[PDB]
Amino acid sequence: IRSAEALALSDCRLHICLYYRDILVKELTTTSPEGCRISHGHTYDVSNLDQVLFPYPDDNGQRKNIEKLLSHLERGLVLWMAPDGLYAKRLCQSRIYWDGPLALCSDRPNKLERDQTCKLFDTQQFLSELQVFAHHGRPAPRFQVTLCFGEEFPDPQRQRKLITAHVEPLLARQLYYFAQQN
Template identity: 30%
Template sequence: MQSPPKPQFASWLIEQVETGQYAGPSHVGQNKFRVPWKHNSRKDCNDEDNKIFRAWAVASGKINEFPNDKARWKTNFRCALNNLSERFKMIKDNSKNNDDPHKIYEIINTEQNHPSLPTQDPQDDLDMIPDIYSSPTEYFPSGNEINLLNNLMALDLDNHGTEEQLWAGEYNQPNPALLGSYPAAAENHPQVLPHQPSYYEVTPLSIYDLEISIHYRKREMLKMTVNISSTTRLQLHYQHEAPELNADRLCFPSTDDLLDHKQIEYTNRILSNIQRGLLLEVRNTGIYAVRQDRCHVFASTSDPSVAHPDPRKLPQNSMVELLSFENYVHELRQFKENNSGSPEYTINMCFGEKFPDGKPLEKKLIIVKVVPLICRHF
């Protein structure tokens, strides 16, 4: 007997809130609802607190994979919710409230508008079969970061007019009275920065601000700005959170909204091996990563369309440098002196396939792009 089709999470969740079938999820205002968020380690956590998470595990067909694992139910629900940032926005995180732990979300779109998958060439089907490899603080720049900012600004000032003289001089630590703090990281999600100001606003630049986007072939599945401070890290995982890492967490999107069956099959094969995934860290010297699970990851900052004779595969359980800030400043200086081309700073990471191998980036099943936003200013 064929199992019923999996429902769309957004429609399913809104229906649960409106019908009041479960005691936890409920309306708290126009287009706003709350979801109970009691940690499973609490002694008073019972089946009632996990009903909505179990219900989605049943509806999504995941209940057969982990029939009694309450933590996995919650992770499955959380990933589905986070991957629909165009539909739901968390406006209050009360998950640490001892008396009534919950989160409040706002429905920011009343209709779901998912772009369809671009048409692909017949040849793409041949290329689809890959070699799948498995095996909360206030911001004040540190001394080393200030040195880096000064080096970058010194290079940049030569090419700008008087309108930008507000950047002249040394970069000093901002006045705490003038500098707001970023909100504390949510339990399951990296810090999302407020509206990015224009270049001309006097706002402290930070080496810890990254733009992260996840692409499944031609389709951008997720794009967000995060702040990975010197005291935090970011775990890119697939339904396998690791609380012991003491890191913010970002879950790879599911393939539910993809249309091509072969793409879904091969992408899911890679996702099943990502699991604990990748740990990202930003230091004063650069951006670093640790591959934590079987899925092989290849990283490059060079032209992705040009094959590399020896693609750089990240070793498992070893911290490696993805981008050196010192090298970037050196290459930027060379560029300003017309001695070389513009330095590359976008980190492309390909999961499960060799890269770069001369194939277009859009043909790769899973690509993660990491962009240090400070480099865009220079």
């Protein structure tokens, strides 16, 4: 019905944040409709997906372990927004834990199967959550995906998980922002 809502619903862009031990080390908005791949090291092939590369870690302290983890993130993780919603495909050797709107607490821990497409966010469910928000004012609809690479919990020797990501479809962010203006 509203043409601004149609635009948001049409948008395939993802907002992505990468953390090394709970420190922001990278933040971007994807531009490609085909999706994006998060990985370690340049790949010299043809691909219509955005290449999000893990940045070089800081020299101090946990560098050796992060590097080992990065070596299991070479092939990386493919993410893309369909009209349907947000999809994920793990291609890497490193295990990938996720939390998000399609996840349960009973289902936890939530792991991405290698080479298997998993759906992390669904637009119809989101629109339903968005309706509940519009009527009652709570709760905020859920649309953030959380990813940890390699670790289900922070190591005994370390306070934080080594590498974490945050993914938001801009579609949800903008629709929620709209709903807040009223």
